[PDB]
Amino acid sequence: EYKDVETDKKVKEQLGELMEPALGYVVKVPVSQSGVKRTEISNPEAITDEDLNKIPNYEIIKGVAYPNYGELVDKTAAETMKYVRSGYVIDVYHSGTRDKGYVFYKGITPSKELPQGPALTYQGEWDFTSDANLNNEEGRPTYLNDDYYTTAIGKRAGLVSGDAKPSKHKYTSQFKVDFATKKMTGKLSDKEKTIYTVNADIRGNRFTGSATASDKDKGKGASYNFFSVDSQSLEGGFYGPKAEEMAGKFVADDKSLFAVFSAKHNASNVNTVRIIDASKIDLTNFSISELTNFGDASVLIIDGKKMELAGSEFTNKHTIDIKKMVAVACCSNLEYMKFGQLWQQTQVKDNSLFLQGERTATDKMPKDGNYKYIGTWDAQVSKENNYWVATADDDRKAGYRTEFDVDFGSKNLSGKLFDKNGVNPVFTVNAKIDGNGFTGEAKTSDAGFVLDPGRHDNVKFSDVAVSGGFYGPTAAELGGQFRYQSDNGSVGVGAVFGAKQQVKK
C-alpha cells in the first residue's frame, strides 16, 4: 500500500584533484637539484595521521638535516590552537641541494556541528613556501638581510615564511565566516599589508574557493613579489566539535607558492546545529565512537583511507586493505545516508556497526505534516555467549523491516523494528523531533525479547537512548541508533537503522 517517495538523485560534483578534503596536507619545500633552474611546488600529500603534536615527515627531514650538520626549527601554532596545526618544519642551516623541509597543516575532529547565529571571526596565522627559481630573468633577490635570515630568497631553495625576520614580517590570518549564507571571506596579512584576500563557500564541514593577490605586479630584485598570483584551489575545513577552529591551504595557479593557515574564533556562547552524523557502535564493548566524515555519507573513512559505499544491490560488501577491512553498506534506495556493519578480517576482528548521514538543513525541515517511513536495519543483541543478529534487506513483506510514523506537526516520532518473519516488533521506538534530529526511547516488548527457545533466557528493557536524524534536502530519509549494556557486559545490544519517506499507493 506504500511506495518510496520520488526524490531528486544526489547531484554529483566531480571535484578537482586538488580539492579533495582531508585531515591535513603537507608539501615538500622545493629545492632545485644540480642543473635544474626552476622547481614547481609538488602535489600536496594528504595527512592520514591523527596525532596533532606529530609534525608530518619530521623524521624524513631530520634524517637529512642531522647527517649534514643542520638544525631544525618548527612553527606549528600548537600553543594557540587546540584542534588544528599549521606552519612548517625547515632546516635553518640549509645549503646545496638537500631537503629544506615541509610546509603543512592538519586537524583532528572535523566538525559535525556548525555554529548557528552571528557571523564569526576566526583569527590566526598563515605560512608558505614558494617556487624555487634560479633564473636571473625572474630576478629573485639576494642579500635582503634586514628582511630574511637567508642570503638568497627563493632561488635554489623555495622561500619559506620561517626565513623571514620577525622585525619586518609577521604573517597573520583573519576570516569572517557566515554559516547562514554558507559563505566565507578573509585576509592573509603581513604586518599591516594585505597580501591575499579569500573567497570560499561552505560544503559539509569543508570550505572551497579562491585566493586573490592584492598585489598583481611581480616586480624584480629587492622589489620582487612572491604573492602576485591568484589561486582557484583554496580548500580547508572546520575542526573541533562545534567548528571552534579552522585550517586549510591553497596553491598558486602557476605553482609558484603554497600557503597554509589556521585560525580560531573567540565567541563565548555559540549555539550550534548538527550537520553530520557519523558514528561507530562497537559490538564487543558496545561503545559509540566517532568516525571521520567530511559531509559525505557515501564514503566511509577508516584510518584516513577512503572507501566508497555505493554499489549495485540493496546491500553491498566492500573490501579495503590497509589488514583486511570489510564493510556491508546500505541502502541503494538511500542517498544522503548510509549504515551497516564494519569489521577486520584476519574469524572477525572488531565487529562494528556504523551510521553516516548528511543532516537536512535546519530551516528546510517540514514544520507540519504526517508521513510514513519504511526501511530496514542491522543489529546485534547478546545475552551471555548467545547472540541474535539483524541484517538489512529489501524484503518489505516479512524481512528485517522498520516502520516509522513521523508527525512533523507535533514533533512526534514512533517506530517499529522487526525481526525476519516477525509479526510484532522486537524493539519499539518513541521519539521527539528537535530541529533536524530526534531523540527518544527504545523498549523491548512488555514481555521481553527471547533470543532462541530451548532454555529461555531473554533480554528485556525500556528507556534506551535513541539518537537519530533526518537526512537529505527534504528530510525524506531518516536514520538513528541506540545501544545499552548491563553487568558490563553480560547483556549487550547494538543497532542502527534507516528509512525512506513513503507516499500512499
Q: DSSP letters along 9-66, please?
A: --------TT----SEEEEEPPB--TT-SEEPPPPPEEE----TT--TTHHHHHHHHG
Given 275, 303, 338, the domain boundary residue is 275
Left, alpha or beta for 275 (phi > 0: left; psi -120 to 50: alpha)? alpha
CA 248 – CA 44 distance, rounded (Å): 12
432, part of any domain: yes
Q: In the block, which residue shows the cell 545499552?
A: 484
CATH code (residue 89): 2.40.128.250
User: What domain count does the chain have?
Assistant: 4
My answer on whether 370 and 489 are in the same domain is yes
My answer on whether 229 and 301 are in the same domain is no
**Which string of b and e fits 418-438 if b means at least 16 CB within 10 Å?**
bbeeeeebbbbbebebebbbb
313, part of any domain: yes
My answer on whether 315 and 369 are in the same domain is no
CA 21 – CA 15 distance, rounded (Å): 10
Number of Cα atoms under 13 Å in the Cβ half of residue 261: 31
Left, alpha or beta for 256 (phi > 0: left; psi -120 to 50: alpha)? alpha
In residues, how long is the chain? 505
12, part of any domain: no
What is the Cα Rg of the chain in Å? 27
Contact 281, 291 (CB under 8 A): no
My answer on whether 138 and 47 are in the same domain is no
Spatial CA neighbour of 190 closest among 213, 207, 222: 213
My answer on whether 119 and 264 are in the same domain is yes
**87 to 75, 220, 296, 313, 492: CA distances (angstroms):** 5, 27, 28, 46, 46
CA 222 – CA 140 distance, rounded (Å): 8
Three cell numbers written together for 364: 528546510
My answer on whether 48 and 148 are in the same domain is no
CATH code (residue 431): 2.40.160.90
My answer on whether 27 and 115 are in the same domain is no
**Host domain of residue 48:** 22-109
CA 101 – CA 76 distance, rounded (Å): 13
My answer on whether 195 and 265 are in the same domain is yes
Contact 380, 372 (CB under 8 A): no
Number of Cα atoms under 13 Å in the Cβ half of residue 244: 12
3, part of any domain: no
Class of residue 38 by CB neighbours under 10 A (exposed 0-12, middle 13-18, buried 19+)? middle
CA 427 – CA 445 distance, rounded (Å): 7
6, part of any domain: no
Class of residue 46 by CB neighbours under 10 A (exposed 0-12, middle 13-18, buried 19+)? middle
- The DSSP bridge pattern shows strands 120-130 and 276-282 to be unpaired
The answer to whether the peptide bond before residue 96 is cis (omega within 30 degrees of 0) is: no
CA 352 – CA 72 distance, rounded (Å): 43
My answer on whether 242 and 383 are in the same domain is no
16, part of any domain: no
Class of residue 281 by CB neighbours under 10 A (exposed 0-12, middle 13-18, buried 19+)? buried
For 220, residues 6+ apart whose C-beta sits below 8 A from its C-beta are 139
DSSP helix/strand/coil, 162: helix
**CA 394: distance to chain centroid?**
30
My answer on whether 120 and 269 are in the same domain is yes
Given 74, 109, 144, the domain boundary residue is 109
- Experimental resolution (Å): 2.6
CA 22 – CA 48 distance, rounded (Å): 8
CATH code (residue 285): 2.40.128.240
My answer on whether 258 and 140 are in the same domain is yes
Given 223, 254, 275, the domain boundary residue is 275
Q: What is the DSSP string of 280-329?
A: EEESSS--EEE---SS-TTEEEETTEEEE---SSSEEEEEEE--EEEEEE
140, part of any domain: yes
15, part of any domain: no
My answer on whether 339 and 412 are in the same domain is no
CA 32 – CA 132 distance, rounded (Å): 6
**Measured CA angle at 338 (ends 334, 341), to 5 deg:** 135
> Count of CB atoms within 10 A of residue 349's CB?
12
Q: In the block, which residue shows the cell 529461555?
A: 456
For 493, residues 6+ apart whose C-beta sits below 8 A from its C-beta are 286, 379, 380, 381, 382, 459, 464, 482, 483, 484, 485
What is the residue type of 23? L
**283 to 194, 373, 376, 398, 495: CA distances (angstroms):** 53, 27, 19, 26, 9
What is the residue type of 469? G
What is the residue type of 232? Q
